[PDB]
Amino acid sequence: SGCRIECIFFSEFHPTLGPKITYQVPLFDTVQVYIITKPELQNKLITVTAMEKKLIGCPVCIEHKKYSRNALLFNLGFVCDAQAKTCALEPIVKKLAGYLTTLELESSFVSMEESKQKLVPIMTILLEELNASGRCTLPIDESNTIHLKVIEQRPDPPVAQEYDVPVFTKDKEDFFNSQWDLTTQQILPYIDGFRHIQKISAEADVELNLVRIAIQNLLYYGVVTLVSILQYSNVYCPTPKVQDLVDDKSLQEACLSYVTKQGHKRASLRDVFQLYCSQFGLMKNLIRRLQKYPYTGCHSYDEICCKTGMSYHELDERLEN
Amino acid sequence: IVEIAHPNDEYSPLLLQVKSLKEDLQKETISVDQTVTQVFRLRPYQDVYVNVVDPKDVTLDLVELTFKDQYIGRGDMWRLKKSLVSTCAYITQKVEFAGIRAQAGELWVKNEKVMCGYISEDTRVVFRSTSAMVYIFIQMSCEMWDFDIYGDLYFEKAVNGFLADLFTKWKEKNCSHEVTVVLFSRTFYDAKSVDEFPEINRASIRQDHKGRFYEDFYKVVVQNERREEWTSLLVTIKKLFIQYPVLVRLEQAEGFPQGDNSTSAQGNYLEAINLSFNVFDKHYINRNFDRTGQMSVVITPGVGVFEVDRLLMILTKQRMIDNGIGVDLVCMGEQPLHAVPLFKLHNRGDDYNIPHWINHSFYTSKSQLFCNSFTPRIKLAGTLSAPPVVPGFCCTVGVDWKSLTTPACLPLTTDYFPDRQGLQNDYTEGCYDLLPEADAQQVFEEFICQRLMQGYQIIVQPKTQKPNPAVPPPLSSSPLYSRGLVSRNRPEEEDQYWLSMGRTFHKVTLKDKMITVTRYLPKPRADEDEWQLLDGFVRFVEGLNRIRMDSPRKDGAFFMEFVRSPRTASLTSSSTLTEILEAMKHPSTGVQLLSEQKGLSPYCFISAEVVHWLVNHVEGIQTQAMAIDIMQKMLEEQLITHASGEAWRTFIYGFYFYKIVDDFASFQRKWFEVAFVAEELVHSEIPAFLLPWLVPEQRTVTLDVDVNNRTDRLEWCSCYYHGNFSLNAAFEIKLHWMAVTAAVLFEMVQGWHRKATSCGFLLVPVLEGPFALPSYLYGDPLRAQLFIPLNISCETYWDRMHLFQEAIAHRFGFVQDKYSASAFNFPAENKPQYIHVTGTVFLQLPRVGYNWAYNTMLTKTWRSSATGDEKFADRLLKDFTDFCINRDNRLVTFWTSCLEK
Amino acid sequence: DNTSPISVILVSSGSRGNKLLFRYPFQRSQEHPASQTSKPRSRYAASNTGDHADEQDGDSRFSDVILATILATKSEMCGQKFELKIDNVRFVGHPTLLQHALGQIKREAPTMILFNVVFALRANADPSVINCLHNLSRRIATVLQHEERRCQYLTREAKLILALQDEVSAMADGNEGPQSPFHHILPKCKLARDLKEAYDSLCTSGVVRLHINSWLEVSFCIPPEAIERSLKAIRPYHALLLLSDEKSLLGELPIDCSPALVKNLQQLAQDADLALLQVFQLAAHLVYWGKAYMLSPNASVCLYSPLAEQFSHQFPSHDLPSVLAKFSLPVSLSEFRNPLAPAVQETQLIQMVVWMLQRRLLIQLHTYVCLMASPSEEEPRPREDDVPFTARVGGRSLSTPNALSFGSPTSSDDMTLAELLPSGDSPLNQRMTENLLASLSEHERAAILSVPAAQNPEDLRMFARLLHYFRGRHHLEEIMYNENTRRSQLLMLFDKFRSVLVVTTHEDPVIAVFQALLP
């Protein structure tokens, strides 16, 4: 799950019959919570999100104001626990504030208590459906069907160079062919081809900064970079094996268990480890091709994934070299 | 000619003006009093000994101005420039030439925006309107219902954000427009079911085996209306977006449906731009008096990719080079990494295509977080070949707000080279010598003879909008149709076109054509004015130039005595056959006879006044025989072959002479309008909104339309006025012209209305769309044809039921809103059409009932306590539906009050 | 960026009655800036008995932030306060009070306050940076009985923030015995990134607060033979001085630390290099192999049963000290822990025995880098000659692209250009000689301490650029740069290409390059 919520509440600085009134859907935010957060809920700085700490976690809050005759000022609040990430709720709260604002501006909704009473099962449905699938398609009025979706907000990307080699970790067939951008459809038949100035001028026929920012967005979703597979060692060969030369190094560095100079001892030290903890492919000249030119099933996933479900070996070669 | 500037020391601004020939400084002034309240205050006297005289050989290469609530033509822009050759230009200047107006703005010189400067003969000009006509379309695809970046939906992003921002900027800059808002989409598998046959097209790839049956759905909101304080349209569009997919889904064919296609799966985009062109091409048929600019905004939530057939693409190219209207924006955000307006050739490596004739822009909301990805994703459960899409520099493109809030008129004077010699084949020249003869219209013979206004060479319009089936979801136009096959046939092959004309005195013009660029050549009236006007009505269509107690006005007297004929409605020994002495001594008392003087009419007396006199003194229906006895000697008109003049309520305008004149054919782009005259009663118009709740046919007058003393040109309009009697029926005047300045004809019609309201009865311009579909010479693709069934629930009986249709028509007359039979002027008058009194409502009378539509040509003026206020038209709609469908006892009492007699 | 734009103090409801801002314009304890001057309460302020600031710069809304946090700061209960307000602002303040009715659990007037010192950033910090600002404000607001108006320690930390991006460390870094890395990894978050309290609680093993700080003191108001055995090779007596200066006196440390601090010149040069930019090497074993004298049967048992269950009974059940007992128990302990450090610690003759038996039987060797010791610590494994050395992370200047003769890009023997015995891995003195030749004396250590910005070019290649730009096949290019060192034309032929760095190319310059090479 993205984030964990537990309680939603409504509040208002209402006139002299009740100074600060609330509606609640459940934590039970008692007298202490409302005393300890009551100065927060009145400000000339409005239509702005603010979240604060508290004993039970973090409340998030937003306000707005209308009906200056016997002035109207109220507040939505949304309270969760602190010690997690809890940073994917904020445009949803600002969007609900916009929903309530436009609903009041064109229907004159909350001028009477009965509308606010009708507004309570709305809170129940939203409090359940945010935790259900994070999306809400609920018609509250004849002119407002509220639409809500939770974004996981995958974090910040690195910088991509152009001497790089990318590998798509997942498989290609998990997606619609019709549903990509067209530059990505012009590159995606050739991704497992290794280096980048090969791939652009070999099939992409695109511009360098364009494909560099496009692959940076791919890294922002689902691809992992590494360095090229120019054959440095040659004497790694003479221990017998089954087909762990071209694919294995890209896989192992995508699993991030070497230093960059794979050299002439790293691979054999890891190879004998994999061997006991279990003709030519033209072994010279993959590099004269390195410019623009005008078991029986393949085994580089099976044993490594059957390991990778565990973690003792991931200790044993995550303190690698 | 001398040139002054006048700031002081240390200042920020610079102020410069001109007047005539300071050399010795002694006689001078501040040239403008209220330039104080224009710009900057100090006391306006003659002497401060500050003011520096300047040579100022420094120019201002581009100037701009705006118009507000006014119609002109670009020939009037040309003469504005010609009177604007050698003069000053300060910011926010109101200026006037020849009766018409302008307000200055946006004057650049090469890097900088300069507040005050001078313009002479080699700059360039840009004319923009804030009084224009805007057609905004909203595409709806399968991605309007999808979430996006920052967490939002494309619908409320697009509508709420973009339309709210644009309407706030319109309200700030205080413009005025005629809007149309069309919502549209497509559906798939609408194959076969009766009453829904005429609406299906077939998508068809010429080798890969896919051809399916599809349809495009339209729905208009507010049709053609100017109104202040918009943005309630946002609320209506929200409600229609909620009720929209059932309005798409549970209709015509409940087999297997698939609505709301993607933009890249299929698409009806370019077709909608094509029908916007097939509205704007017939803009000349009901010309406005206050609106100039034309703007087609298409909003897509797509990406910039569309796929389309080559044929209609080439067709839209050859139609868009004519006039430039189309502007696209995408409310998706996320500008993608390729040449972003582009087309896949949906033909009959796939073939790629880019347009250069379209202004793209992209929206972005107000939220600021960084790595905005340029990609979608969806999880599954389970012989040139020189352009690709990429190598262009598509970095960042904004909104271009100035090209959105001030629509610009067409380019006047652009750059291309002549057609010297060699391969260029066809040539035609015309020399035109006229004669001293003034017993004006002779320019029309060379006008028809030279080009015939793209006469035999054509502009190519094979878009045949024949069918429109509509649904009774809400009152405006909801058609859902197929737009007819393209009747394409290709024009001219392997040939250019060049013309020339000449007046052998001093004037030559040269004329290149695949686009109409002109090369003018210069060396009782003066011939250069006729030459300039000839260049003007070569421009009018398409005109790219190359660069380096009375008042005896004619119609008004007949109009005011025609007013007098209902103003009073609501002797010696007699029977003597001589009657000569009264026939010349009417004026003994104060008898109104205009027997003094006028041009072309020395001895003025009209026969209706004579009938007034000898019905005050002699009897009434024996009048015509003794009037024949009078007419056997004396005369008023030319030669009789008629009755004794014409006795009661009969209509003769000016121009006594027509016998002892050339015409306008219907295929050389005539500007024409229609005005109608209707009878009002105001003491029921107040309870209309108040608390009570429930002998040839034509005659053609080539009027010289001026109340001024110009000595500039000649300027005339051909009225075709129809009328004969007008007891209580409507009275129509066709207005045709292809001639000189518009706003003077506007103020003549303004004087006609302002004389029609007080001292008489009422005048309103009427849209000449009768109840007529597209694929006509008239017609619009946005007219709903609102049917209303006449429920009943009880020889030659069809005439009888037509009569009682007329009887309930004029009874609906009698309640609040009277009727008039608009027996229109082009012949044979197919179905009875009725205009209602002083309002915006029209009927025709043909299974069950009869059909109804609107006037859009009212435009917040033409106003007394009668007109306007669109809710009145809605009230008449609901009132006739209540009086029509056998409601509670109303048609019951109608049957009793009919059968009582 | 790990910055902090705003530090600030305010006033609404200070717990007092006289000599302050309540009735006159602003004035407080030992300070009178009366009659509503330019309001010193925020960061950028030159301070004296009279003080003046600027109020100009916050990139956003300004005074609504100030005049809202005046009361958004305050509460009744004490503790932490984190406030992520909108899109790009986080407020970080953990204040307290001290009000008492003469109970004492100096002072001049009852100048008591619900004080509100707080400093912020924008939305993109790091978690240890967050908790370090937490304990930073915590050590700021202890008691502060230098009871004045003095905000210069606040500006001292403010300039510490803007000037420095990695705050506290040491010139004096020490050792690593057998237990200190996991001894360090027990707390890992106590106080202020501090090797000082780290060594103190390691050595004397008692939590005493001779109050350790960054630069400014705040207030609330044995000779060991294991350690000296781990530091008879490297640097004992500065650490003994540190022991004396944390068991005797406080407030006088950095003026007493830094003044106390062919073969020998390269030795101190490479030890300064290891004090800055060089990494270590170690090794270990594993006893794991599983498929279908003492080679087979114990391995078969290992295939069906973990060894410490079965075989650890038989070595006391038959009373056997020998080579096979050394096969059993120290192999078991080194497999429990896996550096070579216990194999060099626990030795009688085991030193030449562990690698002997390790290469004897078919338990698998591996060589690798020191056990989890990040460069956020001092050092592993004090210096002896029996061990190799490399370097991995450190940024560096350029050798090939700007047309030089002694070419050194990054390849095997990374800088690829008793008589130098002790290290089998030569890139240590490759990197040092490629910094500077070892005959220069002051410039040697000056370049060791001025490779910050590295003689003022800065990095643009790590050898992939060559084959990236042009038609350089790898063995062809080693054919070039194993003999490019001897005439300028052999380097010039591939480095002349500023005539295509006028660029106008947009695909590749390779055709003009291989044409214009040869004659």
CA distances from B63 to A77, B75, B105, B408, B742 (A): 54, 18, 7, 13, 24
Tokens at residue B497, please? 């076109």
Contact C371/C338 with Cβ under 8 angstroms?
Answer: yes
What are the chain C neighbours of B368 within 8 Å (beta carbons)?
87-88
Q: Which helix (H) or strand (E) holds C430?
A: helix C427-435
Task: Identify the burial level of C78 via C-beta atoms within 10 angstroms of its C-beta, where 0-12 means exposed, 13-18 middle and 19 or more buried.
Answer: exposed
Shared domain for A282 and A306, answered yes or no, is: yes
Helices of type H across B654-721: 682-689
Top residue of C1, C280, C289 to mutate, by most chain A CBs within 10 Å, is C289
For residue C60, the Cα-to-chain-centroid distance in whole angstroms is 34
- Subunits next to C (3 or more Cβ pairs <8 Å) are A, B
* Tally of CB atoms within 10 A around C106: 6
CA–CA dist B422, B420 (Å, integer): 7
CA–CA dist B892, B364 (Å, integer): 61
What are the chain B neighbours of C87 within 8 Å (beta carbons)?
367-369
Read off the DSSP letter of residue B161. I
CA distances from B758 to B354, B676, B863 (A): 60, 17, 12
Distance from CA of A22 to the nearest CA of B (A): 28
For chain C, say whether B368 makes contact (Cβ under 8 Å).
yes
Contact A225/A164 with Cβ under 8 angstroms?
Answer: yes
Instruction: Show Cβ contacts of residue A290 under 8 Å, excluding neighbours closer than 6 positions.
Output: A195, A198, A230, C467, C473, C474
Vertex A225: Cα angle to A219 and A227 (nearest 5): 165
For chain B, say whether A181 makes contact (Cβ under 8 Å).
yes
For chain B, say whether C319 makes contact (Cβ under 8 Å).
no
From the list B151, B375, B378, the residue facing A151 with the nearest CB is B151
Q: Following DSSP, what letter does each residue of B70-88 receive, concatenated?
A: ----HHHHHHHHHTTTEEE
CA–CA dist B338, B509 (Å, integer): 46
Instruction: Show Cβ contacts of residue C22 under 8 Å, excluding neighbours closer than 6 positions.
Output: C14
For residue C238, the Cα-to-chain-centroid distance in whole angstroms is 21
Residue of A nearest to C368 (CA): A321
CA–CA dist B264, A178 (Å, integer): 9
Residue closest to B536 by CA, chosen among B72, B125, B76, B99 = B76
CA distances from C166 to C376, C395, C454 (A): 11, 17, 19
CA–CA dist B875, B865 (Å, integer): 16
Task: Identify the burial level of B814 via C-beta atoms within 10 angstroms of its C-beta, where 0-12 means exposed, 13-18 middle and 19 or more buried.
Answer: exposed
From the list A36, A40, A228, the residue facing C72 with the nearest CB is A40
Helices of type H across B406-526: 443-450
Quick check: C392 and A259 CB within 8 A?
yes
For chain C, say whether B369 makes contact (Cβ under 8 Å).
yes
- Rounded to the nearest 10°, the torsion over CA B335, B339, B342, B347 is -130
Top residue of A163, A289, A315 to mutate, by most chain C CBs within 10 Å, is A163
Read off the DSSP letter of residue C19. S
Q: Are strands C45-46 and C52-53 parallel, antiparallel or unpaired?
A: antiparallel
CA distances from B628 to B577, B606, B643 (A): 12, 15, 8
- Subunits next to A (3 or more Cβ pairs <8 Å) are B, C
Shared domain for A49 and A100, answered yes or no, is: yes
Pick the last residue of a domain from A87, A114, A149.
A149
What are the chain B neighbours of A147 within 8 Å (beta carbons)?
147, 153
Contact B849/B790 with Cβ under 8 angstroms?
Answer: yes
Residue closest to B159 by CA, chosen among B178, B139, B176 = B139
Coil vs helix vs strand at B211: strand
Contact B867/B838 with Cβ under 8 angstroms?
Answer: yes
Tokens at residue A157, please? 């990307």
Residue of A nearest to C303 (CA): A277
Structural domain count, chain A: 3
Pick the last residue of a domain from A173, A203, A227.
A227
Instruction: Show Cβ contacts of residue B900 under 8 Å, excluding neighbours closer than 6 positions.
Output: none
Quick check: C289 and A227 CB within 8 A?
no
Interface of B with A (CB under 8 A): 147, 150-153, 160, 235, 238-239, 242, 264-265, 305, 336-338, 367, 370-371, 373-380, 382, 388-391
Residue closest to A251 by CA, chosen among A157, A174, A168 = A168
Residue of C nearest to A267 (CA): C366
CA distances from A136 to A139, A180, B153 (A): 10, 26, 12
Most distant pair of Cα atoms in chain B: their distance: 114
Tokens at residue C346, please? 């626990």
Tokens at residue B445, please? 């013979």
CA–CA dist C398, C404 (Å, integer): 9
Tokens at residue B864, please? 């007394």
Instruction: Show Cβ contacts of residue B762 under 8 Å, excluding neighbours closer than 6 positions.
Output: B677, B678, B679, B680, B756, B838, B864, B866
CA–CA dist B662, B718 (Å, integer): 11
For chain B, say whether A220 makes contact (Cβ under 8 Å).
yes
Q: Does A289 show up as a binding residue in the annotation?
A: no
B143-155 in b/e burial notation, b at 16+ Cβ within 10 A? bbbebbbbbbbbb
Residue closest to B754 by CA, chosen among B882, B863, B624, B666 = B863
Quick check: A217 and B375 CB within 8 A?
yes
What are the chain B neighbours of A104 within 8 Å (beta carbons)?
none
- DSSP β-bridge partners for residue B103: B66, B94
Distance from CA of A176 to the nearest CA of C (A): 32
Tokens at residue B629, please? 């006895």
What are the chain A neighbours of C81 within 8 Å (beta carbons)?
52-53
Helices of type H across B144-186: 154-156, 164-173
What are the chain A neighbours of B261 within 8 Å (beta carbons)?
none
End-to-end CA distance of chain A: 35
Task: Identify the burial level of B528 via C-beta atoms within 10 angstroms of its C-beta, where 0-12 means exposed, 13-18 middle and 19 or more buried.
Answer: middle
Read off the DSSP letter of residue A39. G
Coil vs helix vs strand at B500: strand
Approach to solving: cryo-EM
Shared domain for A312 and A237, answered yes or no, is: yes
CA–CA dist C411, C409 (Å, integer): 6
Q: What sign has the CA pseudo-torsion B261, B263, B267, B273?
A: positive
For chain B, say whether C87 makes contact (Cβ under 8 Å).
yes
Interface of A with C (CB under 8 A): 35-36, 39-40, 43-45, 48-53, 87, 162-163, 197, 201, 227-228, 230, 232, 259, 261, 263-265, 269, 272-273, 276-278, 287-288, 290-292, 316, 319-321
Distance from CA of B361 to the nearest CA of A (A): 19
CA–CA dist C352, C340 (Å, integer): 12
Size of chain A in residues: 321
From the list A95, A142, A179, the residue facing B152 with the nearest CB is A95
For chain C, say whether B367 makes contact (Cβ under 8 Å).
yes
What are the chain A neighbours of C393 within 8 Å (beta carbons)?
none
Tokens at residue A105, please? 């501006």
Quick check: A320 and C467 CB within 8 A?
no
- Rounded to the nearest 10°, the torsion over CA C208, C210, C212, C218 is 120
End-to-end CA distance of chain B: 86
CA distances from C113 to B347, C9, C138, C392 (A): 80, 12, 17, 53
> At residue C493, what are phi and psi to the nearest 5 degrees?
-60, -35
With breaks defined as C to next N over 2.5 Å, after which residues does chain B break? 348, 382, 439, 523, 548, 570, 660, 694, 794, 846
Helices of type H across C251-306: 254-257, 263-276, 297-304
Half-sphere exposure of B261 (CA within 13 A, CB side): 22
Shared domain for A113 and A193, answered yes or no, is: no
* Tally of CB atoms within 10 A around B667: 9
Top residue of C474, C477, C503, C508 to mutate, by most chain A CBs within 10 Å, is C474
Instruction: Count, in order, helices (H) and strands (E) of chain B.
Output: 20, 38
CA–CA dist B652, B555 (Å, integer): 9
Quick check: B239 and A144 CB within 8 A?
no
Residue closest to B284 by CA, chosen among B742, B661, B699 = B742
Pick the last residue of a domain from A129, A149, A169.
A149
Distance from CA of B787 to the nearest CA of A (A): 28
Q: Following DSSP, what letter does each residue of B829-850 receive, concatenated?
A: --S-EEEETTSSEEEE----SE
Shared domain for A49 and A132, answered yes or no, is: yes
Contact B79/B98 with Cβ under 8 angstroms?
Answer: yes
Size of chain B in residues: 901
From the list A174, A181, A182, the residue facing B379 with the nearest CB is A174
Instruction: Show Cβ contacts of residue C458 under 8 Å, excluding neighbours closer than 6 positions.
Output: C397
Range of the domain at A257: 229-321
Q: Which amino acid makes up residue B142?
A: C
Residue closest to B54 by CA, chosen among B115, B11, B4, B118 = B4
CATH number at residue A59: 3.30.450
CA–CA dist B288, B286 (Å, integer): 7
CA–CA dist C231, C173 (Å, integer): 12
Shared domain for A187 and A297, answered yes or no, is: no
Quick check: C364 and A278 CB within 8 A?
no
Q: Which amino acid makes up residue B209?
A: H
CA–CA dist B728, B822 (Å, integer): 11
CA–CA dist C303, C312 (Å, integer): 16
Q: Which helix (H) or strand (E) holds C181?
A: helix C180-185
Q: Are strands B498-503 and B427-431 parallel, antiparallel or unpaired?
A: parallel
Task: Identify the burial level of C118 via C-beta atoms within 10 angstroms of its C-beta, where 0-12 means exposed, 13-18 middle and 19 or more buried.
Answer: buried
Task: Identify the burial level of A283 via C-beta atoms within 10 angstroms of its C-beta, where 0-12 means exposed, 13-18 middle and 19 or more buried.
Answer: exposed
Q: Following DSSP, what letter does each residue of C133-160 receive, concatenated?
A: HHHHHHHHTS---S-S---HHHHHHHHH
Contact B334/B376 with Cβ under 8 angstroms?
Answer: no
Contact B676/B726 with Cβ under 8 angstroms?
Answer: no
CA–CA dist B722, B825 (Å, integer): 7
Tokens at residue C275, please? 């004090």
Half-sphere exposure of A304 (CA within 13 A, CB side): 19
What are the chain B neighbours of C505 within 8 Å (beta carbons)?
none
CA–CA dist A317, A315 (Å, integer): 6
From the list C75, C80, C364, the residue facing A276 with the nearest CB is C364
- Please report where in the chains the tokens 């056990």 appear, as a residue: C371
CA–CA dist B271, B267 (Å, integer): 9
Residue closest to B71 by CA, chosen among B741, B587, B754 = B741
The backbone region for B98, taken as left when phi is positive above 0, alpha when psi lies in -120 to 50, beta otherwise, is left
Tokens at residue A298, please? 């393949």
Shared domain for A48 and A127, answered yes or no, is: yes
What are the chain A neighbours of C513 within 8 Å (beta carbons)?
none
Tokens at residue B872, please? 């009145």
Quick check: B388 and A206 CB within 8 A?
yes
